[PDB]
Design a protein around this ligand. Structure first.
Ligand code: GAL
Ligand code: FRU
Ligand code: FRU
Ligand code: FRU
Ligand code: FRU
Ligand code: NA
Ligand code: NA
Ligand code: NA
Ligand code: NA
Lengths: 989, 989
């Protein structure tokens, strides 16, 4: 007997190493006057759980369809109730045995009917800009071919198949195929026809492909122009016209434009052009720019540039991989509004419409091929497609389609072979093909650290320390002298750094100082631009983002998909506010005497003519003075000192010697730009006259003693515990020391190095920092002033089963009006647990009040959160926010919302108002406890309990980027130590 | 100013290093004719959360009590709604800063009123047999004293305080005190007055203490008798009478009884005696026995003994530390019924009534002092009370009270200083005091491996391998030559071994063989006798046991308190059934020809006269022959061969050469004993004629092919998957390979050694063994016989993200009646993950049937579960049980219920009956899946889903004792390997 299994034919095709069959030559995405009909819209769709059960019932004819239902196209079909999204980071969701596919393989059959007028005859084609991951296509029942390369475009000739009038298009899509083994990016698995489908006419004497070459000679200022045009792979006679430059030339000839204005991310000058043959005309946007590497520097138009980058995935919280155009435009505007100038298309080519937007708004684009075999690493890279000769044609095809589609856009300054694909022969073949095809753009690929087949040295998450050694050209040498000589002559780029997951990222300033200091350093791209949160609702109607595991995944990686500077709806996270400041292209150093400010132009090409420089002096009441000062344009990388009007300094000299006041100088847009309105803030700097130290109240009030209570002015103490039970009428339910916070995503990551690789969160739990207990040692009153007394309460704080502890003494004093509180902390015993030193999250106090807080106001850093190694974007001033807005809406709740650098605070408990002053402290106010915060997996898990949780911290730990990359830097760590700090409290009813 | 805190006086007393004040001389627990009044019953009780808030409102007078309510005494008050139980193993539930106590310290005020008649005047006392942990006692308002030593007795003189008529007793009990630091046993923390309270009259010319000395001369057979009696610490004139021995002697004089019958656990001969003065008489039970160590052997009455022991805690699932007397008697009977002969009072003296029961029923008792400082280990033993001079008086007091109370009982053969208390000067002081006081009993203590201050070498959980080296006297030497010479001359005891947590314990047989082989080995005590489950109910009324964490504990150790041979209600676990067989005191080896059996008397003193030897031959239908055979008494440690009646062997010779049959020889009690009825089984042995190999059915039926289904006789296959969808009408929902089981408690423990210390359960999860997936490679029919065909289904099984897999081929054959299934397993790729070899739990098949199973029957080992390194108690025969009874009711659900050694099985699905035959396999049937079993934390989490989960295993892993002690032994491990095995199936409707 012979075979009896079902569907072996479909599965054999899915297991194919080949690049897909039947498609036209890969070419550029071109704006053409040829008639076109978009087939996007409502299609019919049927889902089958595997190939062996996918019906073979002639559905491709579209007649008598059973089981089909409406579905929009383009779409990621798990976003519409057909199956569910599934998130994995590295691990494959199927057994690793290439090229084989699992039995559980969603098969989607798509069908649409459309009308083809006489414009699409004799010749036309069908274009698919993306199918995840394996498509088969029929038109009127005849097979056109298949598609491989989920984020790449495929075109099929329908001449003689397309019929006048009604036509029926059928597409079978398999989620998984052999191609899934090379599409293992860290993101959601989402099958579907997720990009545009277009019917295009191909008139005779038309234009199939165009290759624009627009160089710039920064010495002469000339533009070097050659525009290739071809039909069916052969060069053709066509006319290229550039009206603005008074140019008419034949395609295929190189000319020298006497003077062009060069293209850059800062000044994205574009010239409108058209290349036309008898039967077709293509409209182009030409940006003249040349890219070169010399003296170990990445240079554009003769100047080293600094990349202020992000890694941009394509994701939408409700449509999956389908990003509507208005979302693309909005988010690119938002990037510019935060001083971003570079984008890495992690880790695949974007929607083809993205390229023209990058050209127009101004971004340096690393365009990356759709290739990642990350899941093979855990097996020592055994069977890695990148080094398997059977995969060469498939991988070269991926690179070719990547290069051909976008080769005409000035914004693309580097080609990238892929991401986390190891090293191998097929990667070298992709580089060789690209170098031969387009030598005008350097090659990028991080996976091969030897850098044998690339033109820049790229790394991800290298420490600040190692980056400094690379910046100096003193990194350790490669074992191969020839390769080392090559790599040392390359400029260095961080294709991913300062992982922006949750609270953070920390340590951005230390990287940036190196970027500004060492020319070899090209800059870096933050990981990543957006969180891939998927919107989920409840019968309550409450909306929250879901992540890995929230969709039934047998195998997932949790919330590592929510690791962005903005949430899935492009709401900024605090890290973006800080990032904007870190990469600001102008440096403003306000003089302490308020006479002027130093201004350095950090841009690479533009001067300062685009900015209006404005100043304001704000005080306790409000603004005292302000205006605008004229600055002679400052050349790029140049420096000057700007005088402020004499009234500003005189105003500084006239203050009371205790009055706080802030002078802020800002650089805003003088006029509307393509990405923001006039007045938009780009850079800023401050100088502060800080408020004098607060006066401790004279201890003139005595301590009144009762059986179970002590009273000292407005404070009533529980005589049993020694802690206050109310201050001026507001109930105090608990007061104690804090040393711990609800772990951030970073605290949950392993900090490599040392024999201790427990995450900091685990070190804390093992140490008991989350379950502190306090023992009362004694209560004592002492002589103060004029019959007054101070009340000292001695305690020891520790945790169950631990011998180490801390002695805490609270000294209370009052004049009847304000309350003086002095806290003294002293280590008792060695703070070591499980053989390693315990580290602290904080040294602070937790006040639990028995009433809710409606409003929180403070003088310090704001408006958003700030921790020791973050908060660059938090400026000095007076701020006020409702309680809900003090919080930060991370998908997985975690420590957040602390306002470091606070000098004074005011909580409003309805009619009463609680004020806190003292030496600089961090402020946090929450309607729920830390234990509720730590336990919560999603924001709906957080509930108010009618209380106010007030945190006053004398010291804080940094947050770092330990979820992926460096942990907290040394200077921001918090090791157990003795400490003392003073506060003052007061209630206004 | 000076102090203002509350309750400093009470707290100062709780923090005291002293042994408690005001009590009478520690003495023996004596049965006296002096009038006594038990004050047990309903008391009044008030709970306060700490000393600083415990009222000082004169409640001791019992007048005008506010906040008091009824509570029984004795009691563990968290067992009655006042607070809650809390379980920790090693870790202290409070900060470790001796002698200080936490602010959260439940304070229980107890009060009772009683009448004192003229019998209690002039002199009387109050006796407290246990208070956890610190008691203060007032009678009619006057303080008698305090108590320390929670499981020790205290007596207070009330002469001149006790008043004629009504009296008021008030007791304040603090849960925590300085004493808690030395009472860190692995058990529930349970405050309360948990043992009897008694008013005793002390007539003039009475007897306060008695010290019985009853030695035995095994050469002459003489008894060496001296009975000390004293009053107020001075020897007194008193008469000792022993009627059975015709003895009248003065107390304080040693005499030589010409002939006594010696006492042993096997023959606990006791002589009734009375010692009397003018005003009081004490009734004693005297067992003549002498204990000695010679030639590195622990000897009683001149013979080396073998300890068949358990560690006995005192626990009740609803009363806490209060064990009712009828429960004590029942559980001690149950121990004897399972061949146990020794008890360790882990880790404190038991209720005083326990000692007379041990004397009467016959146990070798290690009586252990109330001392354990385990929680100091994690800090390098810093501050350990065992070596702190300030604790010497407190610890000597503990030992003194321990020794004095029970010194008169023959069952106590060793004194133990404590448990897991490290090493230190105070332990040496406790040993020195004990040696001087009672030299007739050797000293035990495991904590000091050098054994400097003990008379036996004790260890816990030493591997079988190290035990064998110790048995041979070739263990590694101590650095001190003098101490090494001493320890090598000591016999060796395992005070705890084969940890009996969950499924297990495994490896009991390997220890036992060493015990029988090496005289130096004294035996061992299983950890532990009982699970400390606490009963919990729901509104449903369903009862289940709770463990650590189920009572709100901030700090707990989960289900490690449920680690016993019986559950809290004394229901046997399978481990006890196996243990009974492992330690059976007779060895019965049935001859293969059924002519007779070898019989070895494993006892140390008794012959075989107490046993009736019975035989039976059981066959498929039922019993064929049986009767009783007369055995001449066999001396201890002697051997003989017993002939069986000729009809037995002739019956063996006459069987069909394929018929299964079992000959069982049993040793039962010939007459009622004190611990069981006549006919109770003590030892057994078997000889089996196994059934012939099953015949594979002739493959005469062909394979019928259809579009979506294949049929081969009674099996219908899904043509898409290749798996059967029904066999003879019973629906099959899934069929696949298994390599994993729901981790046992042992699988969750770390196996120390090797660079891999992940628990086996974690190794499995990391390896994906719990989430296997199967890919279909092909289906093929082949020529069988006379037009019949066999159907082969080739598959590959792996898991997501893994490259290793296994190829599984199912060959199906049928003659129309029975179904022949051959399974072939072959490794594909190296089964390595996270750098270490993957191990398998099993090689088997899981059948998921679409109907429920009411009954499971099989021929194999039973009735209870058996795994490769367990099941010693499972004997060969035919068994049948309802589905619920196939399961094992472990508190935390886990893998259990497998019946290894099965030759045939019959599941009844209502009207239809599914039969499985084949070479030996393991059988398991469950109404729920493995994923539900693994997820379940308590038995209510298990739910039936209307299906039958049938597991047929060709190979199984052992279970070991890795939760604490050795993991699975080498010969029971299951490393990935190729395998093949045949089965036959058949349905009877
Ligand atoms: O090496 C550490 C291990 O040592 C063994 O002897 C014993 O099972 C335990 O103490 C365990 O912790
Ligand atoms: O550049 C054009 C290239 O693209 C392909 O057509 C893929 O369809 C190849 O056949 C050709 O080489
Ligand atoms: O014609 C523009 C470009 O496209 C090709 O024709 C092939 O697609 C190339 O030969 C040319 O460089
Ligand atoms: O053996 C009697 C011993 O017991 C104690 O009374 C404890 O109350 C000690 O005072 C005495 O030494
Ligand atoms: O009297 C019996 C035993 O008890 C004591 O009197 C003290 O309690 C000891 O002197 C004696 O050995
Ligand atoms: Na996050
Ligand atoms: Na991620
Ligand atoms: Na258990
Ligand atoms: Na235990």
């Amino acid at each position: 007997g012979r075979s009896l299994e079902l569907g072996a034919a479909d599965i054999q095709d899915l297991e194919s190493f080949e690049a897909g069959r039947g498609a036209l030559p890969a070419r550029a995405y071109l704006q053409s006057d040829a008639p076109r009909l978009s087939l996007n819209g409502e299609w019919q769709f049927r889902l089958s759980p595997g190939s062996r059960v996918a019906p073979d019932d002639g559905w491709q004819l579209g007649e008598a369809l059973n089981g089909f239902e409406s579905l929009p196209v383009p779409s990621s079909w798990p976003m519409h109730g057909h199956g569910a999204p599934a998130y994995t980071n590295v691990q494959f969701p199927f057994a690793v045995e290439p090229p084989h596919v699992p039995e559980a393989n969603p098969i989607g059959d798509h069908l649409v009917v459309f009308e083809a007028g006489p414009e699409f005859f004799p010749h036309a084609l069908l274009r698919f800009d993306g199918i995840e991951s394996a498509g088969t296509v029929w038109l009127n029942g005849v097979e056109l071919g298949t598609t491989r390369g989920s984020r790449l475009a495929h075109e099929f000739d329908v001449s003689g198949i397309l019929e006048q009038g009604e036509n029926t298009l059928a597409v079978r899509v398999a989620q998984f195929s052999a191609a899934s083994y090379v599409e293992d990016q860290d993101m959601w698995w989402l099958p579907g026809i997720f990009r545009d489908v277009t019917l295009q006419a191909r008139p005779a004497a038309g234009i199939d492909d165009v290759f624009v070459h627009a160089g710039y000679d920064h010495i002469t200022g000339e533009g070097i122009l050659k525009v290739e045009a071809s039909r069916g792979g052969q060069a053709i006679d066509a006319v290229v016209r550039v009206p603005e430059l008074a140019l008419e030339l034949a395609a295929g000839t190189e000319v020298r434009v006497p003077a062009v204005e060069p293209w850059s991310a800062e000044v994205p000058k574009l010239y409108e052009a058209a290349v036309s043959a008898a039967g077709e005309s293509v409209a182009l946007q030409i940006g003249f720019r040349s890219i070169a590497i010399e003296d170990a520097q990445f240079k554009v138009n003769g100047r080293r540039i600094l990349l202020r980058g992000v890694n941009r995935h394509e994701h939408h919280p409700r449509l999956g991989r389908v990003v509507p155009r208005d979302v693309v435009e909005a988010e690119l505007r938002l990037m510019k509004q935060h001083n971003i100038n570079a984008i890495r298309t992690s880790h695949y080519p974007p929607h083809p419409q993205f390229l023209a937007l990058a050209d127009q708004l101004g971004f340096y684009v690393v365009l990356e091929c759709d290739l990642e075999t990350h899941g093979f690493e855990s097996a020592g890279w055994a069977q890695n497609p990148s080094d398997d000769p059977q995969w060469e044609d498939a991988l070269v095809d991926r690179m070719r389609r990547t290069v051909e589609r976008d080769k005409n856009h000035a914004s693309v300054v580097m080609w990238s072979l892929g991401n986390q694909a190891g090293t191998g022969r097929n990667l070298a073949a992709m580089s060789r093909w690209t170098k031969d095809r387009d030598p005008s753009r350097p090659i990028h690929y991080e996976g091969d650290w030897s850098s044998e087949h690339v033109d820049v040295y790229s790394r991800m998450y290298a420490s600040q320390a190692e980056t400094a050694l690379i910046g100096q050209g003193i990194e350790p040498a490669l074992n191969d002298a020839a390769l080392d000589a090559r790599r040392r002559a390359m400029p260095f780029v961080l294709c991913e750094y300062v992982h922006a997951m949750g609270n953070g990222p920390g340590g951005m300033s230390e990287y940036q100082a190196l970027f500004e200091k060492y020319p070899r350093l090209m800059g870096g791209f933050v990981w990543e631009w957006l969180e891939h949160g998927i919107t989920v609702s409840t019968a309550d109607g409450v909306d929250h983002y879901g992540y890995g595991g929230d969709f039934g995944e047998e195998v997932h990686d949790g919330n590592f998909v929510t690791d962005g500077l903005v949430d899935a709806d492009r709401r900024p996270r605090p890290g973006l506010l800080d990032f904007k400041k870190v990469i600001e292209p102008l440096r403003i150093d306000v003089a302490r005497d308020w006479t002027g400010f130093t201004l350095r132009n950090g841009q690479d090409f533009a001067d300062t003519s685009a900015f209006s420089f404005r100043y304001e002096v704000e005080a306790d009441g409000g603004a005292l003075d302000g205006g605008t000062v004229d600055v002679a344009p400052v050349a790029p990388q140049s420096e000057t000192v700007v005088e402020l009007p004499g009234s500003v300094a005189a105003l500084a000299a006239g203050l009371s010697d205790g009055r706080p006041a802030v002078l802020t100088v800002r650089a805003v847009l003088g006029a509307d730009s393509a990405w923001a309105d006039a007045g938009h803030e780009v850079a800023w700097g401050q100088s502060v006259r800080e408020p004098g130290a607060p006066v401790p109240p004279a201890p003139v009030e005595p301590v009144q003693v009762q059986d179970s209570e002590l009273t000292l002015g407005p404070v009533v103490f529980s005589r049993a515990t020694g802690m206050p039970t109310s201050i001026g009428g507001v109930p105090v339910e608990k007061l104690g020391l804090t040393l711990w916070w609800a772990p951030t995503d970073n605290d949950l990551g392993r900090e490599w190095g040392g024999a201790d690789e427990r995450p900091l969160a685990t070190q804390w739990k093992d140490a008991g920092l989350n379950r502190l207990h306090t023992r009362l040692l004694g209560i004592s009153a002492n002589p103060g002033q004029d019959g007054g007394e101070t009340l000292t309460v001695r305690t020891r704080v520790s945790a169950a089963d631990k011998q180490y502890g801390v002695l805490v003494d609270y000294t209370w004093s009052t004049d009847g009006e304000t309350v003086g509180l002095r806290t003294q902390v002293r280590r008792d015993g060695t703070w070591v647990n499980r053989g390693f030193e315990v580290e602290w999250a904080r040294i602070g106090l937790e006040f639990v009040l028995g009433e809710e807080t409606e409003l929180v106001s403070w003088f310090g850093q704001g408006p958003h959160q700030s921790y020791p190694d973050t908060g660059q974007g938090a400026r000095a001033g007076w701020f006020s926010l409702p309680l809900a807005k003090m919080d930060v809406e991370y998908v997985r709740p975690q420590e957040c919302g602390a306002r470091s650098g606070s000098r004074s605070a005011a909580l409003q408990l309805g009619g009463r108002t609680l004020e806190i002053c003292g030496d600089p402290f961090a402020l946090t106010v929450r309607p729920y406890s830390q234990d509720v915060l730590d336990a919560a997996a999603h924001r709906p898990d957080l509930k108010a309990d009618g209380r106010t949780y007030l945190y006053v911290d004398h010291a804080l730990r940094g947050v770092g980027t330990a979820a992926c990359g460096p942990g907290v830097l040394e200077q921001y760590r918090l090791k157990p130590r003795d400490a003392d700090f003073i506060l003052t409290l007061k209630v206004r009813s």
